[PDB]
Design a protein around this nucleic acid. Sequence first.
DNA 1: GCCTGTACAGGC
DNA 2: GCCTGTACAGGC
Lengths: 183, 187, 191
Amino acid sequence: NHYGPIPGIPVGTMWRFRVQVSESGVHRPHVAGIHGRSNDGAYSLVLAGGYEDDVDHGNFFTYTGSGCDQKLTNTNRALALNCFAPINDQEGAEAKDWRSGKPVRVVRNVKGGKNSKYAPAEGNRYDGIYKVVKYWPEKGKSGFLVWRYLLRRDDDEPGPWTKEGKDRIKKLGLTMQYPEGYL
Amino acid sequence: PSNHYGPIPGIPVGTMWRFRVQVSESGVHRPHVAGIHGRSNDGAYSLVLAGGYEDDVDHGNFFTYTGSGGQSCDQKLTNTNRALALNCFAPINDQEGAEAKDWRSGKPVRVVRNVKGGKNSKYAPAEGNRYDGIYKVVKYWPEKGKSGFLVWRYLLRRDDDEPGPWTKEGKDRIKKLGLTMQYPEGY
Amino acid sequence: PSNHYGPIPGIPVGTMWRFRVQVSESGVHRPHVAGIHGRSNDGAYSLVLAGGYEDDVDHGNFFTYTGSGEQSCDQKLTNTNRALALNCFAPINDQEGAEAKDWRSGKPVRVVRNVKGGKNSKYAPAEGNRYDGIYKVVKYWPEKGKSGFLVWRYLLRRDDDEPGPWTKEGKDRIKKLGLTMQYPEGYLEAL
DNA sequence: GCCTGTACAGGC
DNA sequence: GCCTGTACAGGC
């Protein structure tokens, strides 16, 4: 797979554990940080830190591929296929009409909080639909080539960190979801 | 692998997991949501008892079971319904069903009981998911469901030398093996 | 369907489409991007000549062809390389290749020429894609490419009673049939 | 890198 | 609604 938001799961929904995120369908892989098939596209990713060169500005963030040089295969190629431009594994690519691209469900996890004030203070939060604007190769903090992506928010649902996003969370009563018995 | 029949090495009867993804990663029941795993032209490998069909009856060592749709439509002996029927040591019959006189010679089914079965079974665990061992399909048959449409029904009977968790000896063995509820890492 | 061999009913030699999606919807060459359509244990149904390998030579009625993989790895007689070899009326041989004495008995390949082949062929159309008819694999062989790695090469030869678009009679027939560049619905109106 | 379906191999 | 690969059926 499903592209785009999950019905009944609005932006700002929160889960304590990744197993809950998986069961909800927002980000199916229990461990892996990106969900995609190389011959299709990418459906979801989790921002949980781990790459110091990534920048998180909320509506704009950069993302580093997985994965000794990296190849535009597996999930890296899948995320590229979301970009509204023909696939290119040499210089990368960029979409002028980036909004016509394939949607990516983005979840932020608390572990992204070291380098980003947009990360939730606890657990995992669904932050809405982002689009791949461009992607390119570069020599990262390991000497070898990494594939990097710029994603931009494209969602009428306001961001959880914005005024209208925080007001909607209070109106819907969306609180942190804990598994039965955990509390 | 996906089509493994029988017990998983290192996973005794009584093993407990909190979440379905753990049950899947262990190989005991691979589908995260579907209640049954099988291939329609091969057989069924595992099923999860989680409530749902009120006419199902669970007596631990054996239970009646209901197939799937895919109520507003007759069920069919296709897909996983057919897979489970193939386990019965009898020729497929999608008209009247069939019964294996030599039922132990049929294909094994790993059976997990889930906490949600507790509303309709005193054998469901109080939490999470529990592997209760190997069962065999004795017989299967169609009947008019509660809504007037056809459902496929199955009788499964336990064929496992590891004692059931509802027995004193099965509880004692589970304690000596040190089995505890397994949670995801860092939980 | 996907694995249809031979000409498409209602699609003569000389038919022209501006974009690859149109060529695909017609059944003539179904892959939008891949230059060859085939199943590795069956055969190849169609291919597109769009340039790309410098040592390929195109003489219209026949051409040399290179399979798929700067090359950094030997080619292999698998996937669509193997499918095209299977069209050759000879036992498959992945060591020296093979050659069919009775090459017309081989399986047919629908051949499309695309404008990008014009740099290396005077037979490419000036615009878009053109169906040029049925060809047969005469022979195929491995050789060292310019990179020094192995490439699989093929010789394809035309076996089609519809005259080639590069002949006077072929052009004249294309005119009488009224064939024109096919564009997507409302394409020129939007431009 | 046709498309929407379906199914198997193998994961552990 | 296990996963990610692969392959075929059939579109027109």
